[PDB]
């Protein structure tokens, strides 16, 4: 009908029919509903299932180049493409991750800068995010209304790091050899590692990617843990060749599925390192890998996110750490500090005691509640007193084993937070 939908489709159904690049997890509900009751939108008859869609942004990339080739003459904007996690964002869109649906929200200042930039010019379809070493660095600016250099400088004006930009005009069939790649890498020299160098012509939507491989095999050592107490670190892997291995997240480490302290070959670069991705064959049990990584990182540690914070020193300091407030060591002082901070007090009340405690200890939302389910509790005054498991089927993985081992500290934190909430809301 002319009033809404159909010929407009609200600009969601028509886009999702053929364009798979904008396939975030928020719009799946709307698309599935609209397609399912296609006979009930206004009129007519139509039924279909469009469930389980994923962000296929790769349509904007034609193909990836692994060998030197010949580049066409023209006007090119050269940028460095970094290595790390990939994200998308568009005018307050949920920060979704490619292939996993992670929703780690960016800080407020970067979101404000991004939405101000997008309000300055509406031609920016989307902008990529990189989360190397738990840091936010601008990656790309796909737009057609204005040149990406203006967008980059506007983003950097607010105080956000942006990649370097170059403009090159070529009027001949210059060969894209290794010398050009090396000089472009030197032009974009920075402490933050980059995976490749990208060139954009007249802001074309379809784009080419060029990279090379320099893999080598000398030796592999234990996985180093950079736990410093600031909750900002990555599980870097140290080799015997004098260089480390860049790891974007613990998910990459557990997906690598490579043995430790053996004949290991991973994707080396000219000056950086890319963790190998399991894509071949072979026999290897998950439990052995999880054990050989958890004993290296620590018995009290486990697998989730990028923090895996310690538990034995929890006490009351971890509550302050997760609430970004000053250190404290007494219950009443911590309660008074929480009451003094209005924002902290407001943000405490919307989360349950169990959820707040599991975030304070950083318990993953994959197996902690699953383990809690198949185990019996004896509770007094709404505080855990006794606990007992009955089935070992969930104890196969070492993560549940170490969670059960630290369950005493978890119960202590749960009781502390429950007491704090009771003293604060009475």
């Amino acid at each position: 009908m002319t009033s809404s939908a159909d010929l407009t489709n609200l600009k969601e159904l028509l886009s999702l029919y053929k364009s798979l690049r904008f396939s975030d997890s928020v719009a799946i509900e709307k698309y599935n509903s609209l397609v399912e009751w296609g006979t009930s939108t206004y009129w007519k008859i139509g039924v279909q299932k469009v469930t389980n869609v994923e962000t296929s942004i790769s349509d904007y990339y034609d193909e990836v180049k692994n060998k030197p080739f010949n580049i066409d003459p023209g006007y090119y904007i050269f940028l460095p493409v970094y290595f790390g996690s990939v994200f998308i964002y568009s005018k307050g869109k949920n920060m979704v991750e490619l292939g996993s649906g992670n929703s780690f929200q960016i800080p407020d200042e970067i979101r404000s800068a991004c939405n101000k930039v997008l309000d300055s010019d509406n031609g920016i379809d989307f902008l990529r995010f990189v989360l190397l070493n738990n840091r936010w660095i601008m990656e790309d600016a796909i737009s057609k209304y204005q040149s990406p250099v203006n967008i980059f400088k506007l983003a950097s004006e607010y105080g956000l790091n942006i990649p370097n930009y170059l403009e090159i005009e070529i009027e001949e069939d210059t060969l894209f050899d290794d010398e050009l790649y090396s000089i472009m890498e030197r032009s974009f020299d920075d402490t933050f590692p980059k995976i490749s160098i990208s060139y954009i012509k007249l802001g074309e939507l379809k784009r080419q990617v060029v990279d090379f491989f320099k893999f080598s095999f000398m030796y592999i050592e234990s996985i180093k843990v950079d736990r410093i107490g600031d909750n900002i670190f990555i599980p870097s892997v140290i080799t015997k060749s004098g260089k480390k291995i860049l790891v974007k997240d613990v998910d990459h480490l557990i997906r690598s599925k490579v043995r430790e302290h053996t004949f290991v070959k991973v994707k080396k670069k000219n000056t950086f390192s890319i963790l190998y991705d399991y894509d071949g064959n072979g026999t290897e049990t998950r439990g052995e890998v999880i054990k050989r990584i958890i004993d290296t990182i620590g018995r009290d540690y486990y697998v989730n996110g990028k923090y895996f914070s310690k538990v034995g020193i929890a006490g009351l300091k971890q509550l302050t750490n997760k609430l970004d407030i000053n250190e404290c060591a007494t219950v009443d002082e911590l309660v008074d500090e929480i009451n003094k901070s209005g924002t902290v007090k407001r943000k405490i009340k919307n989360q349950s005691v169990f959820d707040l405690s599991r975030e304070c200890l950083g318990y993953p939302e994959a197996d902690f509640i699953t383990l809690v389910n198949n185990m019996r509790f004896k509770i007094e005054n709404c505080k855990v007193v006794n606990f007992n498991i009955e089935n070992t089927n969930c104890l196969n993985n070492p993560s549940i084993e170490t969670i059960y081992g630290n369950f005493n500290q978890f119960v202590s934190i749960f009781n502390t937070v429950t007491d704090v909430k009771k003293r604060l809301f009475e």
């Binding site: 159909d6 010929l7 028509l14 009129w43 007519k44």
Partner: protein, 218 residues
């Protein structure tokens, strides 16, 4: 091209292979109703009853269904008689000439269009009154609509009063765009501003939109 012979006045029947599977059925469905139908003078001649059955259906994706042929001047093609005096052809031309943006219209001749075919719920009528032979093709009006809706993806109809129970009349839930009669649905003039809706719906089915100026004769 196929030809069939019956025992009544129409004798030879003009149709296409696309309509072939139901034609024989139609033949028997016209065997026991022609005796009580040809006894009354009709707007088309008996041969003219089967005229719009020969146009190809594979190319066409949108079908426009009208109310009923006007009581006189049978031609075999709905809203086709070029006279610039009767409301039928003038409305069927102006419903799309203004939307497309062209002027100085004298007729659209939907026959030559390879994507849109005109249609009527009832094949014919009597000289003097309308819907005077609806009973004789009450199930032919079913089988013809079933056959055409199986060859096209979008069905357009004019007049909600005579097309309210189309969904009950249809078996396969094929998409059916409902519209109002260009002259008067029920004491209400309609400008037929839903052709862009038809175009966008046909586009949504991974098909080219209908060019409503291909057959514009000026």
């Amino acid at each position: 091209m196929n030809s069939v012979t019956i025992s009544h006045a129409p004798y030879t029947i003009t149709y296409h292979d696309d309509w072939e599977p139901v034609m024989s059925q139609l033949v028997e469905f016209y065997n026991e109703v022609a005796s009580w139908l040809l006894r009354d003078e009709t707007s088309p001649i008996p041969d003219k009853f089967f005229i719009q059955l020969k146009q190809p259906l594979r190319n066409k994706r949108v079908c426009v269904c009208g109310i009923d042929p006007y009581p006189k001047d049978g031609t075999g093609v709905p809203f086709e008689s070029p006279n610039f005096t009767k409301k039928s052809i003038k409305e069927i031309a102006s419903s799309i000439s203004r939307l497309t943006g062209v002027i100085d219209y004298k007729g659209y001749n939907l026959n030559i269009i390879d994507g849109v075919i005109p249609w009527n719920y009832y094949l014919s009528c009597k000289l003097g009154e309308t819907k005077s032979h609806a009973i004789y093709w009450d199930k032919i009006s079913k089988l013809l609509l079933q056959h055409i809706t199986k060859h096209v993806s979008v069905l357009y109809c004019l007049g909600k009063t005579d097309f309210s129970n189309i969904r009950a009349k249809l078996e396969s839930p094929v998409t059916t765009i409902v519209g109002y009669h260009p002259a008067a649905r029920d004491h209400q003039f309609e400008k037929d501003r839903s052709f862009e809706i038809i175009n966008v719906l046909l586009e949504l089915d991974n098909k080219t939109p209908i060019n409503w100026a291909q057959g514009f004769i000026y």
